[PDB]
Design a protein around this ligand. Structure first.
Ligand SMILES: CNc1cnc2ccccc2n1
Ligand SMILES: [Cl-]
Length: 115
């Protein structure tokens, strides 16, 4: 069901190394809907290559546009399993401190703060 269940640890490590080789300026991001989520739709894919200069505030705007949300729909994003302390941090800095041992950066979205 989840990305980690679909691909082996060895397969996930190797896909991050291929992104380092072929898209060296991109952050490898896994974005998944909270398994309780009723209101928000699913994304068209799971694995995203994010330009390393964008901050978390801009990534939230990108994901709202990808999901085709309207102005009043609530959206909450966890990174590495927890709330973001700040949305102003460049994703290169977020990646270095919150990356998974496989080298992906894991995000989960819900319509409620209570995941
Ligand atoms: C951490 N060790 C490695 C080993 N081989 C690699 C090949 C391509 C890109 C990154 C790589 N990193
Ligand atoms: Cl690149």
């Amino acid at each position: 069901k989840t990305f980690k269940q679909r691909r082996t640890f060895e397969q996930r490590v190797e896909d991050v190394r291929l992104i380092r080789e072929q898209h060296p300026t991109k952050i490898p991001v896994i974005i998944e809907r909270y398994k309780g989520e009723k209101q928000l739709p699913v994304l068209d894919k799971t694995k995203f290559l994010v330009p390393d200069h964008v901050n978390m505030s801009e990534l939230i705007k990108i994901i709202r546009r990808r999901l085709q949300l309207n102005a009043n729909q609530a959206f909450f994003l966890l990174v590495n399993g927890h709330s973001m302390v700040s949305v102003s941090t460049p994703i290169s800095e977020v990646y270095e401190s919150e990356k998974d041992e496989d080298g992906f950066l894991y995000m989960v979205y819900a319509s409620q703060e209570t995941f």
